[PDB]
């Protein structure tokens, strides 16, 4: 629920203290916050670990650790496919938040009127 906010700004009638000192005016802007994207995460951790364990048990031959290297390559291909799917969905469907353009146009249809 919207909390109180009367006795928080430094105003004429207000005889209290300014517990809330906003650095900018509280005016609902016609834009919305942008959704973050991209992050150096480097996926494929479980397959990397199992491949490292296999290579430690054996040496470096591809015919020995085939059971693990095949899964590692499959997981790498799946990660590439997931990256491509995310890049595609960035323009089709956004997960979590909605397209900022929708709210931008909605506010453009009925913008703010603070200056009367």
Partner 1 sequence: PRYELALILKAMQRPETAATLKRTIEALMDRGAIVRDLENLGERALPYRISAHSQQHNRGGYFLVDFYAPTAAVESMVEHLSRDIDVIRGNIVKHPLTQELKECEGIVPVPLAEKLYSTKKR
Partner 2 sequence: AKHLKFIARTVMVQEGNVESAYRTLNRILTMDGLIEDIKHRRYYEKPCCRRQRESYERCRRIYNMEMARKINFLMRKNRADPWQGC
74 by DSSP, 3-state: which?
helix
- Per rule CB under 7 A, is residue 11 in the interface with RNA? yes
* 7 lies in the binding site for RNA (CB under 7 A): yes
Residues 17-36 touching RNA, rule: CB under 7 A, are: 17-19, 25
Question: Is 104 in contact with 30 (CB distance < 8 Å)?
Answer: yes
| CB of residue 30 to partner 1, shortest distance in Å | 13
- For 25-54, the DSSP string reads -----SS-PPPP---------HHHHHHHHH
> Using an 8 Å Cβ cutoff, are 9 and 20 in contact?
yes
Please state the closest distance from residue 78 (CB atom) to RNA, in A: 37
In the complex, which residues of this chain contact partner 1 (CB under 8 A)?
4-6, 9, 11, 25-27, 114-116
Q: Give the interface with RNA as residue ranges (CB under 7 A).
A: 1, 3-12, 15-19, 25
């Amino acid at each position: 629920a919207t909390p109180s906010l009367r006795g928080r700004l430094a105003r004429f009638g207000n005889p209290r203290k300014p517990v809330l000192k906003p650095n900018k005016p509280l005016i609902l802007a016609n834009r919305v916050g942008e959704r973050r994207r991209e992050k150096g995460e480097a996926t494929c951790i479980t397959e990397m670990s199992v491949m490292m364990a296999c290579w430690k048990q054996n040496e470096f031959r591809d015919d020995a650790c085939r059971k693990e290297i095949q899964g590692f390559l499959d997981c790498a291909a799946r990660a590439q496919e997931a990256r491509k799917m995310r890049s595609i969905q960035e323009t089709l469907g956004e997960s979590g938040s909605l397209l900022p353009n929708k709210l931008n146009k909605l506010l453009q249809r009925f913008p703010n009127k603070p200056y009367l």
